[PDB]
Symmetry: D2
């Protein structure tokens, strides 16, 4: 049986409320030990080692937790046969992407969470964590880059997102689909992400103690420029626009982002729109303004790629080619 290391970070899978019925819960109160002992059947498929790295809600996920996970997975690679990372639902898609571009362990790296707290009736966390371990233990999971395993389904870190606020089935690769389905502890793998991941990326976080500063700004009718401006006045290395439709920007937001791209801030056009690419060649001259199209990356994911891009180049056209390959 293979050696599997769980790195716990908290989330709802390690979450707790005074009632199994009521929807009221808090997170950061429940240790990995508890999670493992709530899933006894684990000892049938793996030798499980729990380390707590942090205990937080993922709404509170941040750069320094990201650096710590990659360095740790990179460091501990050859002392285990795979990792599961227990994590909150809320920014799971952001952390899966970041580790997808930064881990050089091509052994299975599998994120799992849960939507209902550990205390609640028909809690999803147990079967979810079991299925994370199957996937982390399956030799076929290797070289697929970093994975999210939720609701019997193996999702790639790049395309996976949360679709619903409350649904146990919220996790979906809404653009290119899942990689495989888990039935009875086996997986029929039918897809692997083509975009470059893990040991095929030039991104090395082994020495960074910081990440470039990149903010997200939202677009809508009568959008204030004050958020765009506040980020510029702080001298931000990059900004991502959550554009409307095909990555389009309200007049006021557009002019402030035009200016900043010329004083050398990286500006990436993404979209608030849940599926589909922010394309080049539509209503925006990218090459004129020194803007980069996000493609299928939603704003929070374009942030991750851009922070990582900014550590190699501040050049608009090389940052475009990074958003075309990763």
């Amino acid at each position: 049986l293979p050696n599997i290391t769980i790195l716990a970070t908290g989330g709802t899978i390690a979450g707790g409320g005074d009632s199994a019925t009521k929807s009221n819960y808090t997170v950061g109160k429940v240790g990995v030990e508890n999670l493992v002992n709530a899933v006894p059947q684990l000892k049938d498929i793996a030798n499980v080692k729990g380390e707590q790295v942090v205990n937080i809600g993922s709404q509170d996920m941040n750069d320094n937790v990201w650096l710590t996970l990659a360095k740790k997975i990179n460091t501990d690679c050859d002392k285990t046969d795979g990792f599961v990372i227990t994590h909150g639902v809320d920014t799971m898609e952001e952390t899966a992407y970041f580790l997808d571009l930064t881990v050089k362990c091509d052994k299975p790296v599998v994120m799992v969470g849960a939507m209902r707290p550990s205390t609640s009736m028909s809690a999803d966390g147990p079967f979810n964590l079991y299925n994370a371990v199957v996937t982390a233990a399956d030799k076929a999971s290797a070289n697929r880059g970093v994975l999210v395993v939720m609701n019997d389904t193996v999702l790639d870190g790049r395309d996976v997102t949360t679709t619903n606020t409350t649904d146990v089935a919220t996790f979906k690769s809404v653009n290119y689909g899942p990689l495989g389905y888990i039935h009875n502890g086996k997986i029929d793998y039918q897809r692997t992400p083509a975009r470059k991941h893990t040991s095929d990326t030039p991104f090395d976080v082994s020495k960074l103690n910081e990440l470039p500063k990149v903010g997200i700004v939202y677009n809508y009718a009568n959008a204030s420029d004050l958020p765009a401006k506040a980020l510029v006045d702080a001298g931000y290395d990059g900004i991502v626009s959550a554009g409307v439709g095909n990555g389009n920007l309200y007049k006021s937001v557009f002019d402030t982002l035009a200016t900043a791209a010329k004083t050398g801030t990286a500006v990436v056009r993404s979209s608030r729109v849940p599926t589909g690419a922010t394309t080049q060649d539509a209503e925006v001259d990218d090459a004129k303004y020194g803007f980069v199209a996000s493609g299928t990356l939603n704003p929070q994911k374009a942030r991750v790629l851009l922070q990582l891009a900014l550590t190699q180049t501040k050049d608009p056209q090389q940052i475009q080619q990074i958003f075309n390959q990763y």
Copy 2:
């Protein structure tokens, strides 16, 4: 044959000879913007031009860019007092394109503006052979012609062969059943939207608090949750006399109460199924009436 007025706003759709088959088709250009530049002033014009010109026509069609169609449909849904069909339409493909979608969309928007059954269902969006309510409807894909969907409660009816089988009607109060009277107003309260993600900056939310914004809507993570910095700045703003509504960047499901955020403790308002841009619509109009978190939340539970 019905008298249907087309209000043009611009967008990806701006000649369909078969309209004469179904209606007397009179048409006025209100403005000609891309809908990414849609603003409160266009909104107040549309609200008034429809409230005034209601007795004059049997129904309305509003050609609109696709980008902010869901913000304008819901605004008109809460401000319009005409319970004759009001139908918004756009197109994903240009009029100069192979298989442009715009022609059939306009046709089916006029079928829908002319159907007596379409009355009293609130402001509607007709795209891709589908009648959608102005509240739940949003754009799900950056380029697909089938982008427009009621992703929480689903569509009101399908249009086939210029006929509608209507199996649903929105329960949330719309049009003449709302206290939002916009006929005297020449500006709406200033409402911002801020985005949550990992290591979220508090500078967007601070900038808005510094301008004396009436309202701020959080595009939270998951179930409306806030990064700590933003939670700190907004917790402060909710008693500065800035109204704070928690919504989600997640494109379906409700931002609920009774989760991880004690809303009464901060004077925060859960948006329900209102995504952020839609939440700003209701939050703006709520603030023409009250700044009471308790009473703002009562309006999020009724419209």
Copy 3:
């Protein structure tokens, strides 16, 4: 606290102490089959046991296998004359499984059977935190817990924290608004379903015509279309005195009239949004009343 009766039928769900929090929970085993063996007789029992025991309780919950839940919900939807909540529930995972779905499903089915707002919405299916109408609801995935969806018109409301925000109600006539009275009947007309695909055999459709089947439903291709052999055999059957309803194997959208099939020329009935198994439900009950293609089609347009 409401008096809620649970009718057990078997399935993947057949001890939730928190039920006492919300209702007086009395429970009777009507039958214990897997729902793949669901039949007309179970259906007539359920219809009668609910029509009789209506005055006796404040609402109903029916534990059912997931496989044929959408056929039984729609049958009960057209036959039940109790306009008190009737709520069907099952589970995708066994009760002996990690994270079994069944416990919370039953809980939320009793929340829904006990909500006064749930009255007069027809027979409901409550799965995965969601209230779905018996007509539009179907299973979309062989193993996912989120399988049950109203794929054409969407759900009636979401259940959160034992509360329902109901934003929709089915317009198609249900329960006491239908002429289907099943209280005297001990069998339903024999209706078959045949499948269309490439090089489709006419032998299924022929076998059914040879038994003197009252009705045959085509799982057509695309918009209800038929392979030539099946079209020939069914064109014949529609004037043999076998009623023929065109539905689709395609899991969403309506089988429309005015497409490629002249329905009046053959005496065929377009199913609308009724998938084949649901179409058999309505076709069976239509034939307790008429064999008139014109009048059968009128019932497909109303229920």
Copy 4:
């Protein structure tokens, strides 16, 4: 510019009604020439050659049309740089699969159709056919097996199905997702089907003038055994069950299929259910009855695989291993 051969078979893209508005149309009336000249912009991306192979509605698709297409594509492979196949919507998913297992031309083979007739307002066929040609002309489309190109989206022949009866967006790979998206005549390919296709399959139709006889039977409440029986009395080589839920069968259907599997008929359990696998190890003992699980193949697609399986073996366990690899 590359040499692209269109093989026309009819369908709605070659369909016609007396009114652009009304939904009334017939098919089999309009020639390939017409379709090409309605898309002038084609000459910008390819040298287009039209051959009419048949003019029928795809509701009328059959074995002999299937054999003719494969033999033809196989034969004419090295006399062109790619094929588009214009086809009806209704059984497009059945023909795409069949050619996916039978063409040994690893040059792009791309099926296209349309939902609105050629005569109708905002007809989809023109842009659809243009996008079929982009895809057929794109070197990256080679070795992806046979494709369906519909509504700006490149779908694999194995997983692609029609989801809606009337919607221009009906074509979807509802299980594993699309392969790529088409914007402005370019494709970002992010996936390739893992299941074995084209020149990796043992299936050779180069000499067959017939295909084994395989029927589909539907399951539902109070399901008649008479359709199952009629297929047996005709001595059918195989039967596919459109089961309920996880590929389950009503009592009466089950017993007749149990009998036939023992007199040597191949019986495959599929599902009427639109997405998800008919799994082994659920409520049915497959190995006991000599039944094969379909996996993700819907009934019409399991038919295609089974007809092709029956031409190599009548053995239940080898037919299972074929449904596990193809």
